[PDB]
Amino acid sequence: ADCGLRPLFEKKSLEDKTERELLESYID
Amino acid sequence: IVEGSDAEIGMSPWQVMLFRKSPQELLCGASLISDRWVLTAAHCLLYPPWDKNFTENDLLVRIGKHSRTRYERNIEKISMLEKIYIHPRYNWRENLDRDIALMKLKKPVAFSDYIHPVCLPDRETAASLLQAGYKGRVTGWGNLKETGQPSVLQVVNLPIVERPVCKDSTRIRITDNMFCAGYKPDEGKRGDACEGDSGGPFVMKSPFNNRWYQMGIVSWGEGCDRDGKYGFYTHVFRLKKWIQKVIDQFGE
Amino acid sequence: YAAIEASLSETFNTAADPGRRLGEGSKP
Ligand SMILES: *[C@@H]1O[C@H](CO)[C@@H](O)[C@H](O)[C@H]1NC(C)=O
Ligand code: NA
């Protein structure tokens, strides 16, 4: 319900320094 | 964490520090999965060949931390363990098969910007996300090199590895409750988990719902960041049923 | 508890991981 979602990022619509590296990896 | 970078604040709010009472030492990491339940590796809590066998009264958990050592007043909460459950088929003689354990907090931790549980994957989340080439994230206050302590929480993104490749990287028997992750020796990047990182979570972010899912538990490896070696992770979904059981039964 | 102790160390040691010491990681 609450879980998986970071108060200081997801919930504040905000991206940490290296999230992109993870998403990009799904594309390759 | 070898070749990591410093975590941001509240970047990994499920991250838990497992703390030894007397003497005071960092034992390994763990992860918050609910307000009462903590998931770590079993080999942190029990490993007979080293006469290692802790109990609910030997340990403490520190939640919401960032600095490894500093007491973080009005941020970190500390909790006491009510019950420990190591997996019944955890084999510590041969290859740390089923290296997983559950800890119940005496009191339910309160959630902050700093403290928040992680998602456990269901069948297809595990099946969609956990694929070789896909990167996950590892966190801990473990050592910086295979023997050196970090100042604060360290974080690294490691690619999952093809099961063939895991198996032909080692002489150790790779059961189905393990997966491995890390760079190939000429992938240019590198980095691994290290000592005192075990039990810490390997998580991935779902591209469908922005949620983080703990896919693996940091389990074992032949050293740290060794070329042509990878890091091994307890497959959290394979063990979902046991987790399910321990929660539904013990602790209402 | 959470009750300013100052009797909890802020200078301790990361313990020793059997996990990292399997196989070639076995130490002398
Ligand atoms: C470890 O210690 C506990 C508590 O005394 C004991 O009940 C348990 O059976 C022990 N496990 C082993 C096999 O060392
Ligand atoms: Na490696």
Side-chain angles (χ1 to χ4, degrees):
Chain A
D2 218 346
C3 103
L5 294 143
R6 285 175 311 174
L8 293 179
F9 288 97
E10 276 69 69
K11 289 178 171 190
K12 298 174 65 162
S13 280
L14 266 162
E15 290 189 20
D16 67 62
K17 292 172 174 193
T18 58
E19 285 197 32
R20 183 45 103 250
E21 179 179 8
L22 309 184
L23 169 67
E24 295 190 17
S25 86
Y26 296 152
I27 268 48
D28 316 272
Chain B
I1 309 277
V2 173
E3 285 285 56
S5 285
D6 311 42
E8 294 174 65
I9 297 290
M11 204 200 207
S12 171
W14 29 84
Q15 179 75 45
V16 170
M17 174 175 305
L18 194 62
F19 203 57
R20 179 174 201 172
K21 270 175 174 169
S22 167
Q24 297 182 5
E25 37 176 14
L26 203 217
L27 295 177
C28 49
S31 46
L32 199 59
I33 66 179
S34 80
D35 66 333
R36 312 195 90 277
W37 282 99
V38 174
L39 182 75
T40 185
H43 84 254
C44 278
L45 303 189
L46 158 94
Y47 187 66
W50 289 15
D51 307 311
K52 176 187 279 270
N53 187 358
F54 292 132
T55 37
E56 299 80 5
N57 20 272
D58 284 321
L59 295 212
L60 276 199
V61 302
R62 303 175 62 175
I63 306 167
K65 288 193 68 48
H66 184 262
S67 179
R68 192 178 70 91
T69 41
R70 141 123 84 264
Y71 172 76
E72 302 179 272
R73 209 159 53 81
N74 203 65
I75 288 188
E76 133 194 7
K77 183 147 161 199
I78 300 180
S79 214
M80 261 177 315
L81 264 21
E82 176 182 320
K83 241 295 133 50
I84 287 177
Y85 313 86
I86 309 201
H87 190 271
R89 213 129 60 264
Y90 155 49
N91 150 249
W92 51 261
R93 269 157 256 72
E94 185 192 343
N95 68 337
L96 292 167
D97 177 55
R98 278 145 171 119
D99 191 10
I100 186 201
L102 273 164
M103 298 176 300
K104 193 189 176 192
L105 308 178
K106 260 171 169 58
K107 286 165 47 208
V109 54
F111 302 171
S112 48
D113 302 351
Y114 306 103
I115 294 181
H116 204 93
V118 79
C119 289
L120 290 191
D122 51 12
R123 155 157 278 104
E124 57 268 81
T125 283
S128 248
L129 278 173
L130 181 57
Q131 290 178 67
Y134 290 174
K135 289 169 163 186
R137 200 189 259 167
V138 198
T139 23
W141 300 274
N143 299 335
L144 299 201
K145 307 152 290 267
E146 179 186 12
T147 24
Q149 301 166 151
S151 218
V152 292
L153 194 63
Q154 284 308 290
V155 74
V156 71
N157 299 321
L158 301 182
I160 298 178
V161 176
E162 315 80 321
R163 293 208 124 221
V165 183
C166 297
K167 271 136 167 159
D168 272 90
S169 76
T170 171
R171 290 188 182 94
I172 319 187
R173 192 185 48 96
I174 305 313
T175 92
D176 279 12
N177 322 304
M178 301 170 189
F179 61 94
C180 90
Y183 297 92
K184 305 179 185 320
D186 21 18
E187 273 193 287
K189 302 249 269 119
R190 57 188 311 133
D192 188 345
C194 208
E195 305 221 4
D197 274 338
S198 300
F202 179 100
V203 297
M204 299 167 97
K205 190 175 187 173
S206 168
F208 303 135
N209 65 3
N210 287 35
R211 298 207 179 189
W212 293 87
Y213 290 89
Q214 185 179 0
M215 298 307 309
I217 299 181
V218 175
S219 188
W220 67 268
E222 292 180 84
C224 295
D225 192 42
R226 300 254 195 117
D227 270 37
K229 294 271 148 182
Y230 304 102
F232 283 71
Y233 299 86
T234 307
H235 196 318
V236 175
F237 178 61
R238 298 279 300 193
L239 291 300
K240 191 70 176 288
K241 13 78 69 44
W242 173 73
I243 293 175
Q244 206 83 50
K245 179 253 247 52
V246 181
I247 264 110
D248 288 37
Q249 194 175 355
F250 320 88
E252 302 298 353
Chain C
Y1 51 161
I4 277 225
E5 53 289 288
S7 70
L8 159 147
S9 171
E10 303 199 3
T11 146
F12 47 82
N13 259 237
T14 309
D17 222 343
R20 289 291 113 168
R21 303 221 172 99
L22 258 49
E24 300 191 10
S26 268
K27 286 203 163 186

